[PDB]
Amino acid sequence: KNYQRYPKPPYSYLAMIAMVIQNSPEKKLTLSEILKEISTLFPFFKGNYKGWRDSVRHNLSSYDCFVKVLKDPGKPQGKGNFWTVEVNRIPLELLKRQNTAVSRQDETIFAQDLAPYIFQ
DNA sequence: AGATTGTGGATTGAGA
DNA sequence: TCTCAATCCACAATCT
Ligand SMILES: [K+]
């Protein structure tokens, strides 16, 4: 296994997932839809590194703020479910812009905090 | 068959 | 020097 860090946008995966969910019409998205919407946020995600898609999937399950909503309520073991975000479960500091080489390269193109786009 | 989803074991390494 | 978000991977389902 060859671990590598990539020049991803200077926001946590949690923050970006939460932003796309909260800015969707029904405040819920399938994994496939989350991945498509994240890809539109920054050109990085359209590049040839695709492992971020795995990181997003991992994050949905690992953080308690993301709550699966069954696509079919009679199939609790079905997949392709919707995901929601409970903002009162978000660790607020994970919504701040990160201090990384990417943000230091160009601070002005990155909002300092995503909380205004996630909380009502 | 086939591709994706949902969850977790585990290591990595820059920011702090 | 220590934290934990980032990242790579297996597993075991469903999906097709
Ligand atoms: K979760």
Side-chain angles (χ1 to χ4, degrees), chain A residues 1-3 5-120:
Chain A
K1 313 167 43 157
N2 175 27
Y3 188 92
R5 296 281 172 78
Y6 301 85
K8 63 168 280 282
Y11 300 104
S12 68
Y13 286 116
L14 182 161
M16 303 188 281
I17 298 162
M19 181 181 84
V20 302
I21 293 173
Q22 286 296 90
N23 286 281
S24 70
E26 316 215 281
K27 296 185 170 63
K28 76 182 190 207
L29 292 173
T30 66
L31 173 62
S32 180
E33 292 163 349
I34 291 167
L35 295 176
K36 171 80 47 43
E37 304 212 359
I38 288 177
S39 86
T40 76
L41 289 177
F42 297 97
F44 167 83
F45 290 127
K46 292 166 73 184
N48 201 42
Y49 171 67
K50 291 307 175 203
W52 65 265
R53 297 168 75 85
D54 193 330
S55 295
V56 163
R57 196 172 88 255
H58 181 94
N59 266 253
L60 283 170
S61 294
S62 71
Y63 288 105
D64 198 51
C65 59
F66 302 119
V67 174
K68 190 166 46 73
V69 180
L70 293 173
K71 167 163 71 163
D72 191 334
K75 299 167 149 133
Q77 276 63 54
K79 292 182 183 274
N81 300 292
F82 298 111
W83 291 92
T84 64
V85 62
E86 306 309 315
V87 302
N88 73 26
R89 300 184 184 187
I90 293 174
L92 191 61
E93 177 278 345
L94 297 183
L95 305 185
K96 191 190 73 233
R97 185 180 67 208
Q98 299 168 323
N99 174 31
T100 70
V102 174
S103 55
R104 291 189 298 273
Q105 282 153 18
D106 193 357
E107 298 281 16
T108 57
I109 70 180
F110 299 117
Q112 195 264 339
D113 207 292
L114 298 190
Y117 314 100
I118 288 162
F119 285 87
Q120 303 301 128

